Amino acid sequence: VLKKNPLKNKQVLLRLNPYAKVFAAEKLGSKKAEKT
Amino acid sequence: KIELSLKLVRKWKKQLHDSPSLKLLRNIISAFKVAVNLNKEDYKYAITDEKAFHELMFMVLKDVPQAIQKMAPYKIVKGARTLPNGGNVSRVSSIVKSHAGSLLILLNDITNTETAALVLHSVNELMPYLLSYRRILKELIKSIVGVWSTTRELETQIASFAFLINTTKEFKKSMLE
Amino acid sequence: AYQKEYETAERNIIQAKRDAKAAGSYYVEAQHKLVFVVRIKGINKIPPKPRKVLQLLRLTRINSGTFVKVTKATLELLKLIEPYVAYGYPSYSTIRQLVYKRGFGKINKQRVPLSDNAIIEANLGKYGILSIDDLIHEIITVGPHFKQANNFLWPFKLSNPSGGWGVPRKFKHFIQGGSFGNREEFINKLVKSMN
Amino acid sequence: SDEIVWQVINQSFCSHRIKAPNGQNFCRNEYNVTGLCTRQSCPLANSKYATVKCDNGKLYLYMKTPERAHTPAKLWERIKLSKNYTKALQQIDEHLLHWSKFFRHKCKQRFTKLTQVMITERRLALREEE
Amino acid sequence: QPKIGYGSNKKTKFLSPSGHKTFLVANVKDLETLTMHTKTYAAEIAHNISAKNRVVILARAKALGIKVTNPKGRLALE
Amino acid sequence: PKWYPSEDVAALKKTRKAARPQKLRASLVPGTVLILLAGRFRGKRVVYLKHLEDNTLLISGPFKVNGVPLRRVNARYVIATSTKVSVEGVNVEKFNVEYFAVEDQKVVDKALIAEIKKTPLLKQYLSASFSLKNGDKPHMLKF
Amino acid sequence: HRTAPKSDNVYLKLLVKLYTFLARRTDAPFNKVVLKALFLSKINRPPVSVSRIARALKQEGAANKTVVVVGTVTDDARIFEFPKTTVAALRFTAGARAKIVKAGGECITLDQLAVRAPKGQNTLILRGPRNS
RNA sequence: GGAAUACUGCCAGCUGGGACUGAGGACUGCGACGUAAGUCAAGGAUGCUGGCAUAAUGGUUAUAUGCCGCCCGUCUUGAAACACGGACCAAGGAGUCUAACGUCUAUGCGAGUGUUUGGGUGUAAAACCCAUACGCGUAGGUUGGGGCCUCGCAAGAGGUGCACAAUCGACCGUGAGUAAGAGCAUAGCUGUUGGGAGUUCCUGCCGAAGUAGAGUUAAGGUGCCGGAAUACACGCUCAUCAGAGGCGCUCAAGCGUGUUACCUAUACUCUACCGUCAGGGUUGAUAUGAUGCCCUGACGAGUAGGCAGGCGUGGAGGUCAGUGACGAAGCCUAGACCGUAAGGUCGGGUCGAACGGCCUCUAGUGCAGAUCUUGGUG
Ligand SMILES: [Mg+2]
Ligand SMILES: [Mg+2]
Ligand SMILES: [Mg+2]
Ligand SMILES: [Mg+2]
Ligand SMILES: [Mg+2]
Ligand SMILES: [Mg+2]
Ligand SMILES: [Mg+2]
Ligand SMILES: [Mg+2]
Ligand SMILES: [Mg+2]
Ligand SMILES: [Mg+2]
Ligand SMILES: [Mg+2]
Ligand SMILES: [Mg+2]
Ligand SMILES: [Mg+2]
Ligand SMILES: [Mg+2]
Ligand SMILES: [Mg+2]
Ligand SMILES: [Mg+2]
Ligand SMILES: [Mg+2]
Ligand SMILES: [Zn+2]
């Protein structure tokens, strides 16, 4: 009946993508590349 | 929901004539309210027998005023019927305040002389409690004037106007204006 | 698997640039194989030649937009409609946000919202796509089934940009100082404001 | 022939039909439980049918079956509902056993309303008798 | 300027502020078609009815418990 | 079942709205002085003691200092000032929401006065009312 | 093309109701095909003569199939020998009906065919030549 | 050498303040977490607190006081005004029936079809029925192919093949071909040719060359009327031709050139609503006309052109065991209700004897202006 935007509602975000849960714990988005 | 039975009305009337209590009066009045509101609207009571309904109407209009008077006997003062001061009167006053607009609905739904006379008499024995209210005393005098205004039977009009005189000449203060 | 692939690909491109610079040899990126197009102009005062092209690109109203595969055939179509559209290379983040927020699926020509993986599965399992992110991968790359997945997506309906259009006057080409035209990576700035 | 009869009655002159301002239609048929011209409603349309209808003080139940479609004089079987409301509903359900839910529900509702009307017309016409 | 966009909602269409759809009534038999639909419908006595019939219609309507939209019309004014 | 259902009863759909404990604004902390913006004691400075389960903050004048008794106040109708008092002296467990449906106030007031004495001029601050003078712009005003 | 027959015939509407229900509730495409055929106009319902029925049955393996004609069937005196089959169609001319009955065949309305073959099993639809 | 910062970019990173929406009404689904049981922010708002009426208030009407306007038409902006015209009243006020061919749709029959050319019959033009003629009709190979059969869970494997097409040919007489025909009649709508031969009741729809709330934005604009900076930064110009809706402006409220901020529309996004379209669900029967009910989605500018649906006016048949001196029809009604609207219902007034509603077929919606004419008045 109504559209729930994934970006603002975590439940539907996990429903669309399960790996988002794990990625949030891993924080790969803020991952550090090696200084090398 | 309790169902009206010819047994239950008989018991209520049975204990009305001897040692009534405020609980009984509220029960009777609530049943009366359902009875009069059947066509026009939660309710504790259900009505299914025409005998029980007719008996309820009879005992209510002809004797609930009697029990009300017996519990809280008014005293004639300077020609006016006035209630005394006391707690029991106040409890009964709220009870008549819970009967008044059922009488009003009956008044608005008068269609013949004898029903008018019965409703007006039962209303007559309940003035001294309803003089304390103005949503009721106004609508009372507004309704019976409505009956006095719209009836096509000269006897019904005579009854309404005789009621207006008898009640008005007694009190003259709240109603006459 | 896709997340690791994306991270490795980005790191590989960056490392290739750094290595080429260290060796002293220039590095040239592969030409982008995907573009995103958005409608800028009203239907009126449009000749037939661009009008027919706009229908093919699934753009029927102003501010609508779609993804387009980059080829010699498709590039000339964009050249035909250069005045009336603004297009550029879409980054992964913009495609993700578009697909999650404004994503709509064509199910019997009825623009069904993509609120569950099952909806996408029932349509696209034949092509080996079972989730929204699988579709996003097929879009961000040029997969063997890119045409079908892209056609499944309804044309995106975008609001006017929140911050604004930038330049005071839109109807000039991007270098000349107007909204429409090929703006390449900066499309990402625009679309995010619109979405 | 019930479907043919209904279709003629629908797209031609249902004389008892009244077209209300809203567009809803009302069959004037006294036997009609639901006074709305529909497939399930016109006693004319449907061979199997039932109604609560008041005669004098009594609230009788009228039954209609395809067997008596001929001989319309004797078509409607007359059953006396007991004055006790609970017994009346029990009798209605019993007689309408294995009977489509529409007519049963509408029949029960009509019995309730007719009982209330009988009570309230007793109210309006209370007299000194008894 | 009138146009279709101004159209009222179906659930609220053809509804008086009392919440009752108006239905024209000529005689007692037509009144009785509104026996149970007291919540959905309210009766309206036709303009051409004589005064003698209107009181009968009003009495039967009160007995049935059906709201009349125009009582005290031709029995009272305004 | 004494009446068959006239018309029908439309059951309400199940509601997925569970009540949860309130998350109060950061400034409100126990032992924080407050300004009341409405009611009998509008513009009167009071102390904050604890947050009740029904989301009504509990406040004491103290009645000794300023004549404001123990009372429930809505959080949104209150400003929180940056000055604090230590509330550890007063225990404030017994009285609760249902209790609200003199001696206790005296017990609370003794403990709260004990902490009030240490800070200079605080009793005078709590005694006096607050109001907006001409030329006072709330948005700059640090409370 | 059409969504319902332009004709106001009660019985055709009843048949259309039955067949649209079956097509909705049956997986077999036969009901869908006949439903779409029922809407057609007279020009788009050319008569299929008993002659064509004879040819359709002479095709190998179709001898025992139930021939279906959404429309009318007309007689053809050109033939002397006609095989027995249970043709089904909307209408049957007196000559065609007599030919079918005489040869041991029989003619049924489309409702009777639906009762026989709700999924159109072993059916053979035919359509007349719409040259003009 | 060591880095930091700036910029660009990402985060399925936190946390705060706002505003509009609360659509849906037994459950079903994707989920999330829970040892588990169960719970939840997961297919559209629920909970707590307080008050809840002679009130809150709402309507009508009348004076006095002052301000503005103030012959009429047109015109005008957004609006009075302003720019342009005006003997006076009452009327009347710019051509007709009918034919030929053809497309489509519905019905009846069907290698047929049409009767009425006549007669019979007739509660009598009628209705029912017979012939009597003539009119227009008749006189295969293979591939694909909707469909149906077998195997297969399915994709497919096949088998068989309507219409029709494709080419391949035979025969009749090189096509309109045959080798297994469809037409006739009636009615509706309607194209063209024709025989003397201004606008167009309301709404909607399709198409060459929409309503309401919130936000964003183009074109524009931010001295006041008027909602927005009399903001910034440059180059200029005040010329007796300065220079731009009204008032007004001159270090501009005039230009060109850049910067942000801000105002807001038939534009864009979301929601709700109303319409058209499309795709759907629903019968060992629906809690309301399967032409019903319900679900889902898309669109609403549109010139030329075309189509549909409603309102109103009469005619006829049928019907409401309709309405009526206790007041029918007609007319008015700055009253109430309904419909987006054409209008409808009621109330009142008027009226004072009969008429209306509804199903069908048949006719049939309000204005403009000119030549002037007549009477009457100067
Ligand atoms: Mg929706
Ligand atoms: Mg802004
Ligand atoms: Mg945003
Ligand atoms: Mg009238
Ligand atoms: Mg033809
Ligand atoms: Mg063969
Ligand atoms: Mg926020
Ligand atoms: Mg062949
Ligand atoms: Mg073949
Ligand atoms: Mg809008
Ligand atoms: Mg706005
Ligand atoms: Mg339903
Ligand atoms: Mg469309
Ligand atoms: Mg269009
Ligand atoms: Mg008539
Ligand atoms: Mg009128
Ligand atoms: Mg309105
Ligand atoms: Zn009917």
Side-chain angles (χ1 to χ4, degrees):
Chain A
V1 302
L2 177 64
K3 184 137 170 54
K4 298 208 163 166
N5 180 19
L7 309 175
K8 299 180 176 181
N9 191 12
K10 295 187 178 181
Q11 307 286 336
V12 56
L13 169 64
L14 298 189
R15 164 152 49 94
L16 271 294
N17 184 24
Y19 173 86
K21 172 197 185 171
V22 179
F23 157 82
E26 293 318 324
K27 286 315 304 159
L28 311 175
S30 301
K31 190 168 183 178
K32 315 216 309 188
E34 305 182 3
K35 60 176 182 58
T36 184
Chain B
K1 295 178 182 178
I2 305 298
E3 186 187 3
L4 277 296
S5 175
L6 200 70
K7 265 207 161 188
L8 290 169
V9 184
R10 282 178 193 279
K11 293 187 289 293
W12 286 329
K13 183 184 174 187
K14 183 198 193 78
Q15 62 187 352
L16 190 147
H17 295 285
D18 292 88
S19 67
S21 68
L22 298 170
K23 188 169 184 175
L24 306 179
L25 293 175
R26 312 142 186 169
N27 277 312
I28 294 160
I29 282 167
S30 60
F32 195 60
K33 284 174 83 170
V34 180
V36 179
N37 280 14
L38 276 167
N39 281 350
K40 292 176 177 176
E41 186 176 0
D42 278 310
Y43 285 125
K44 173 158 184 162
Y45 290 103
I47 299 168
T48 46
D49 189 357
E50 186 185 1
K51 307 296 185 182
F53 175 85
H54 175 67
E55 185 172 1
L56 181 59
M57 295 299 291
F58 186 91
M59 65 158 274
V60 165
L61 301 167
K62 287 175 174 292
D63 295 307
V64 160
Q66 299 290 328
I68 286 158
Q69 181 179 359
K70 286 190 292 292
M71 281 195 170
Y74 63 89
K75 63 183 182 293
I76 194 75
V77 175
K78 63 170 188 88
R81 296 182 290 114
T82 56
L83 299 165
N85 284 345
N88 198 44
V89 176
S90 179
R91 280 75 176 270
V92 176
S93 279
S94 183
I95 287 175
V96 184
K97 194 200 176 197
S98 53
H99 181 74
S102 55
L103 298 164
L104 286 167
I105 294 155
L106 294 170
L107 282 167
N108 296 329
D109 303 332
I110 293 170
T111 51
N112 44 8
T113 295
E114 301 288 25
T115 310
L118 295 163
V119 174
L120 291 163
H121 171 65
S122 182
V123 172
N124 194 73
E125 291 183 351
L126 297 167
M127 293 297 102
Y129 308 83
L130 302 185
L131 293 168
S132 78
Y133 311 107
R134 299 171 220 159
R135 310 264 157 174
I136 293 160
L137 182 63
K138 291 181 181 178
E139 291 180 349
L140 274 173
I141 299 303
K142 188 171 178 161
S143 297
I144 64 189
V145 161
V147 175
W148 168 87
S149 64
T150 56
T151 187
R152 298 187 175 189
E153 293 173 6
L154 180 63
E155 288 67 33
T156 289
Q157 192 158 94
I158 288 158
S160 303
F161 180 63
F163 184 76
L164 284 167
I165 287 172
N166 302 332
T167 50
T168 305
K169 76 211 204 303
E170 266 167 49
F171 305 106
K172 292 179 173 179
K173 276 172 176 111
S174 61
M175 291 195 328
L176 185 63
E177 190 171 359
Chain C
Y2 291 153
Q3 176 56 22
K4 299 325 298 166
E5 184 178 1
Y6 293 134
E7 288 181 348
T8 52
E10 183 180 0
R11 184 181 66 78
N12 284 9
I13 292 161
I14 291 161
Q15 194 65 31
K17 279 195 191 176
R18 290 171 166 191
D19 290 5
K21 290 172 72 175
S25 302
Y26 44 71
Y27 165 79
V28 298
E29 282 187 52
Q31 296 202 147
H32 308 86
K33 294 171 68 172
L34 181 66
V35 291
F36 183 62
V37 179
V38 187
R39 183 70 174 284
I40 305 299
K41 187 63 150 199
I43 186 55
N44 55 33
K45 288 183 181 181
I46 296 282
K49 208 95 173 168
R51 186 177 62 82
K52 75 177 189 294
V53 174
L54 290 172
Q55 284 173 39
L56 179 60
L57 304 181
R58 297 192 299 261
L59 313 181
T60 62
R61 58 175 59 269
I62 193 173
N63 277 50
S64 49
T66 58
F67 301 114
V68 179
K69 188 199 304 187
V70 180
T71 53
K72 172 57 66 154
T74 56
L75 193 144
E76 286 294 344
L77 290 166
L78 298 187
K79 195 174 177 175
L80 293 173
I81 59 161
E82 198 73 20
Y84 317 119
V85 304
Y87 67 90
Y89 316 109
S91 44
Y92 168 70
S93 180
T94 68
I95 296 153
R96 181 168 169 282
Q97 288 182 12
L98 279 175
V99 170
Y100 277 90
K101 174 160 178 179
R102 305 276 191 175
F104 278 84
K106 184 152 68 182
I107 313 179
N108 310 340
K109 307 168 182 179
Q110 266 199 354
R111 189 178 170 271
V112 166
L114 309 176
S115 55
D116 182 18
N117 283 327
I119 287 159
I120 296 156
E121 171 271 333
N123 301 307
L124 266 53
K126 48 192 63 52
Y127 309 118
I129 290 180
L130 303 180
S131 67
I132 175 158
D133 290 327
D134 298 331
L135 193 151
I136 292 167
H137 176 260
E138 191 78 12
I139 295 295
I140 190 72
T141 52
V142 171
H145 307 282
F146 171 85
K147 157 167 212 182
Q148 289 79 325
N150 187 17
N151 190 277
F152 171 78
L153 279 172
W154 196 271
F156 292 93
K157 303 177 185 294
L158 306 179
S159 185
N160 281 30
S162 182
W165 283 98
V167 293
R169 294 190 181 182
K170 304 194 304 195
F171 301 121
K172 293 183 179 179
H173 182 74
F174 192 76
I175 66 177
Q176 302 300 320
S179 301
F180 69 79
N182 193 332
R183 60 175 67 192
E184 305 192 36
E185 282 290 342
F186 288 85
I187 198 71
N188 303 345
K189 175 164 178 187
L190 178 65
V191 171
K192 283 194 179 200
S193 60
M194 293 177 71
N195 174 32
Chain D
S1 64
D2 288 350
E3 201 71 41
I4 295 176
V5 165
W6 157 250
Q7 199 173 97
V8 181
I9 284 173
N10 192 359
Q11 288 80 27
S12 313
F13 186 71
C14 194
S15 61
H16 309 106
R17 191 187 323 252
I18 309 177
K19 191 174 186 180
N22 54 21
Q24 184 80 19
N25 305 320
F26 296 70
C27 282
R28 201 171 312 188
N29 290 318
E30 60 192 1
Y31 296 97
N32 200 340
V33 186
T34 181
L36 299 172
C37 199
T38 70
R39 178 67 182 84
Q40 306 176 268
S41 307
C42 282
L44 317 185
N46 294 310
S47 56
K48 268 199 163 183
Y49 183 80
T51 297
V52 188
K53 180 182 176 184
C54 66
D55 290 346
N56 287 55
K58 308 101 178 174
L59 283 74
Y60 280 101
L61 170 55
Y62 290 74
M63 318 287 316
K64 184 193 179 176
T65 59
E67 309 298 347
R68 298 180 307 277
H70 71 273
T71 65
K74 298 176 191 174
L75 164 56
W76 298 87
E77 309 303 344
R78 168 93 54 73
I79 303 176
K80 186 169 178 177
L81 310 178
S82 178
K83 298 297 183 180
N84 292 167
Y85 175 86
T86 60
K87 301 187 181 178
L89 292 181
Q90 179 181 341
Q91 288 175 218
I92 292 173
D93 203 357
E94 183 178 1
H95 285 305
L96 307 180
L97 182 63
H98 291 340
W99 184 258
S100 63
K101 65 176 177 63
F102 166 80
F103 299 114
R104 190 209 318 267
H105 184 68
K106 266 49 186 172
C107 177
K108 292 182 179 179
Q109 283 187 339
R110 185 144 191 161
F111 177 74
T112 67
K113 180 60 184 187
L114 290 184
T115 47
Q116 291 179 355
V117 164
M118 183 278 288
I119 297 169
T120 47
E121 62 85 20
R122 183 63 169 163
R123 183 175 49 103
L124 299 201
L126 294 172
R127 301 292 294 166
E128 185 176 2
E129 284 77 0
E130 294 179 352
Chain E
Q1 191 274 326
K3 58 181 74 175
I4 196 66
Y6 286 108
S8 66
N9 170 29
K10 288 82 163 197
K11 301 176 284 319
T12 68
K13 198 159 176 163
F14 302 119
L15 279 178
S16 53
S18 60
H20 284 88
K21 303 190 175 185
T22 60
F23 181 78
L24 277 294
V25 177
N27 50 66
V28 173
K29 188 174 180 180
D30 298 302
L31 176 67
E32 287 173 308
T33 54
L34 308 97
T35 301
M36 42 195 178
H37 319 288
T38 62
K39 282 52 162 183
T40 314
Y41 288 91
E44 188 173 309
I45 300 160
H47 75 284
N48 54 46
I49 314 300
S50 63
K52 67 182 179 181
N53 296 114
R54 292 178 67 88
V55 72
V56 176
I57 297 293
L58 188 153
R60 183 52 178 177
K62 190 183 285 293
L64 294 170
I66 180 63
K67 201 170 68 91
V68 178
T69 50
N70 54 341
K72 290 176 71 65
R74 188 180 277 92
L75 317 184
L77 73 165
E78 273 76 12
Chain F
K2 296 303 183 296
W3 283 106
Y4 203 76
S6 181
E7 293 83 3
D8 193 358
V9 175
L12 279 294
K13 286 174 69 172
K14 184 178 173 185
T15 181
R16 296 182 183 176
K17 298 293 171 62
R20 317 151 202 183
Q22 179 169 352
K23 191 168 178 294
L24 291 173
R25 55 163 68 97
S27 50
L28 292 171
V29 171
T32 299
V33 177
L34 300 176
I35 312 193
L36 281 72
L37 315 164
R40 308 314 98 199
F41 308 87
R42 67 183 84 79
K44 221 155 195 307
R45 278 79 68 100
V46 192
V47 180
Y48 172 67
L49 305 183
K50 73 170 179 176
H51 163 247
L52 294 179
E53 53 268 21
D54 61 354
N55 302 339
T56 59
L57 314 179
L58 196 143
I59 57 170
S60 85
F63 184 90
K64 187 70 166 185
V65 180
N66 60 15
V68 186
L70 281 188
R71 189 169 180 170
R72 296 168 67 189
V73 65
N74 200 335
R76 295 293 300 278
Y77 296 80
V78 173
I79 293 171
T81 45
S82 59
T83 72
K84 276 75 167 173
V85 299
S86 184
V87 69
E88 286 75 0
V90 66
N91 62 346
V92 299
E93 300 83 0
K94 179 185 154 183
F95 53 86
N96 294 327
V97 173
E98 71 285 0
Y99 177 75
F100 272 98
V102 174
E103 65 278 16
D104 293 3
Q105 171 56 333
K106 283 188 177 201
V107 176
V108 167
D109 286 346
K110 277 215 179 177
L112 207 58
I113 293 288
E115 200 66 47
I116 288 166
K117 297 306 297 183
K118 265 77 75 178
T119 61
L121 294 174
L122 200 67
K123 177 183 183 62
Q124 292 70 15
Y125 179 47
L126 299 181
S127 66
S129 296
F130 163 87
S131 64
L132 297 182
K133 315 293 139 64
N134 296 116
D136 290 335
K137 299 161 196 172
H139 59 265
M140 41 204 68
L141 282 175
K142 175 170 135 184
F143 288 78
Chain G
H1 186 193
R2 290 183 175 182
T3 60
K6 181 58 174 171
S7 179
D8 62 358
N9 182 357
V10 173
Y11 304 102
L12 181 64
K13 287 159 161 169
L14 292 166
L15 285 188
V16 162
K17 177 190 299 187
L18 184 156
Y19 263 61
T20 188
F21 167 88
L22 291 190
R24 189 185 90 245
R25 296 291 299 283
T26 59
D27 291 331
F30 174 82
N31 301 310
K32 297 178 177 68
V33 167
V34 176
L35 171 62
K36 298 299 293 185
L38 283 176
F39 302 162
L40 296 177
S41 52
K42 177 175 172 163
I43 305 302
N44 308 328
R45 288 185 292 99
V48 171
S49 51
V50 178
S51 61
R52 297 294 300 274
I53 298 194
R55 272 292 189 246
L57 308 169
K58 267 191 49 172
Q59 291 310 293
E60 58 261 22
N64 286 324
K65 291 182 180 180
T66 300
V67 178
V68 180
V69 161
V70 182
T72 190
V73 177
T74 55
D75 193 8
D76 203 354
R78 288 182 298 185
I79 303 297
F80 299 77
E81 293 82 3
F82 176 73
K84 166 182 171 168
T85 43
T86 305
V87 183
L90 274 176
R91 297 177 188 171
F92 284 93
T93 60
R97 194 177 199 96
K99 286 289 190 61
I100 292 176
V101 169
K102 179 178 166 187
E106 187 260 328
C107 62
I108 56 171
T109 59
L110 299 176
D111 63 358
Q112 278 167 327
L113 183 143
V115 181
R116 279 199 188 189
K119 293 185 176 68
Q121 173 170 346
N122 213 42
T123 56
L124 178 64
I125 302 175
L126 296 176
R127 307 198 274 112
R130 67 225 189 295
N131 192 34
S132 181

